[model samples]
Target chain A: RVAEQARRRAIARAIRQVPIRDILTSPVVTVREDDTLDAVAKTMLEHQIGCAPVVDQNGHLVGIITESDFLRGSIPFWIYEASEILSRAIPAPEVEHLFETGRKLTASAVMTQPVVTAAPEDSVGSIADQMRRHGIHRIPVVQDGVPVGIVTRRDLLKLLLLE
Target chain B: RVAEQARRRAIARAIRQVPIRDILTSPVVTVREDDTLDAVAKTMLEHQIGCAPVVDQNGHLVGIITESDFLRGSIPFWIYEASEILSRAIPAPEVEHLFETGRKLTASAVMTQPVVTAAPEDSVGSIADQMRRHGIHRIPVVQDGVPVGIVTRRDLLKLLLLE
Candidate 1:
């Protein structure tokens, strides 16, 4: 019982006291509001990340675009059987068609607005809980409304693994 | 030093011996290979998940679709100035444009292939380490080459927190 208690306490301390900045990815990757999904996708692919913070000309974070946003944004507001769209496969020719038709859909159109953010000083524990509540993989670290860094589920795994 | 040693040992034991099935999410949510990106997006949105396993007609896990795939699929192969696409915005007309042009891309076209998987008896420690090494969010639980369930970082976090 005593060993178990100590284990629990140690785990709690790591979560509550470890600041988010310790693990956040710096030189934060971001996208401009007017950026197209094509660009957003490439940036994320280049960064090997799943999401990017959306900022204005002033670099003020207005929203975040993630794979989830891509999924949601690509869907039309009008729909009938969900399976109709779900059962089809896309290949290269259709990709060309999509780019021509959807070139105007910008990052701002799809990004999840009223962005959920974390400050550098926030505890790892708090952020972990917040992530679970939001069902999000990453959270941008904000300072003065500008994105400075970010954390993902993978980052938290390092903490859990004691590596 | 002794207490720290004890703590380390306890953590190691927990990770090495705990069956992945104990922590994995069962009754996994998945998508079919023929599914369109639009359908894939909706399923993820409705489930509030980031990715889904792609299954073949035989109900075997063949690949996986994610937001990353959506970003990749949405782009046209043609090249231009990176900023040009980045600075543009996509809206309703663009969405329609994308669909008409890109309807051929399906879950199979966009999904990550040769998925990484875990077995029922795999250790948490190894999976945690695997997640860090690969920068992935989840690993499907496969039995006899058929996907049975999955494990995510959130699931591991719950264990670390002893919740």
Candidate 2:
């Protein structure tokens, strides 16, 4: 019973007292608003990350983009299905043009605007709550409108694994 | 002091007693192994889901695909960048061909195999540990290699927000 109590205490303390800064990924990878969707996708793949903060030339956070954002921006499968079914009638060049347009779309056109952000000093408990409320998996930690770090759902999950 | 202790106990009990079935998304939206990337992307977008379990013809789970998988399989931006710079030399048809090939890839070619899974009765605490250990955000709840439900990091985080 005593050991169980100690473990409970530890869990509670970790959630309430541990600041997000301690767990956040620092020197966050950010993308420019003018960046193309192709560039954003490459950045995510190269970094092996799911999301990144969208910033302006002045480095102010303007929006956020994630893998889901790209999916939302992608040409719907129905379009492809229709194109395939009507291949005999639809010219091949028209199909190519459709995909080309999607490929050239910019980040500012696809990123989620007015993104939810967290401060460095926020507690893990609070961050978890914010994520739950917003249905977001990652939150950018910002200071003076500039991104400083990023906190992912994986970061909070790691806390529960701590001894 | 007494109230703090009670709150700690509540948090601990919640983590220990809550079975994943109570929180998991059941009658899960699944995709087949041979499903095209366009189809899988459509399923995810249609369901507003980030991940799905990949099954075979007999409904045995073979792999798991997520938004990250799609990003990984996408055409590298460098190709597009190089094509743009060398547009005078690289014909438009070649660029279209590259993207068309990417679009035609299937889930089996891109999904993560030997996926980590969970049981329906597993505790939230145990599920969190599994996710942390595997660097995964979601897990399919299976019985005899067939998925019955799915749980995400969001589901686990929701426990923390409970009063």
DockQ metric for all predictions: 0.02, 0.02
After aligning candidate 1 to the native by TM-score, how far in Å is the CA of A14 from where it should be? 41
Which pairs of residues collide in model 2? none
- For model 1, how big is the iRMS in angstroms? 22.3
Give the Cα lDDT of each candidate: 0.61, 0.64
Q: What is the TM-score of chain B alone in each candidate?
A: 0.74, 0.76
Write one digit per residue (lDDT tens) for candidate 2, span A1-163: 7964564454345344567776553457998999877677677667756678889999999888765554355332222223453233335664465456556787788788644788888877788788778876678888877888778765554333211
Native contacts recovered, each model: 0.00, 0.00
Q: Model 2: runs farther than 4 Å from truth?
A: A1-163, B76-95, B161-163
Question: TM-scores for all candidates?
Answer: 0.45, 0.46
Taking the tens digit of each residue's C-alpha lDDT, what string does model 1 give over A1-163?
Answer: 7964564454345344667765553468898998877677667767766667899988999888766465344332111112233123223443344454346678888888643689998877788778778876778888788888778765554333211
Cα lDDT of model 2 by residue, B1-163, tens digit: 7964564454345444567665553468889989877677667767866678899989999888876565455332223223453233334665465456556888898888745788877876788788778877678888777887777754554333211
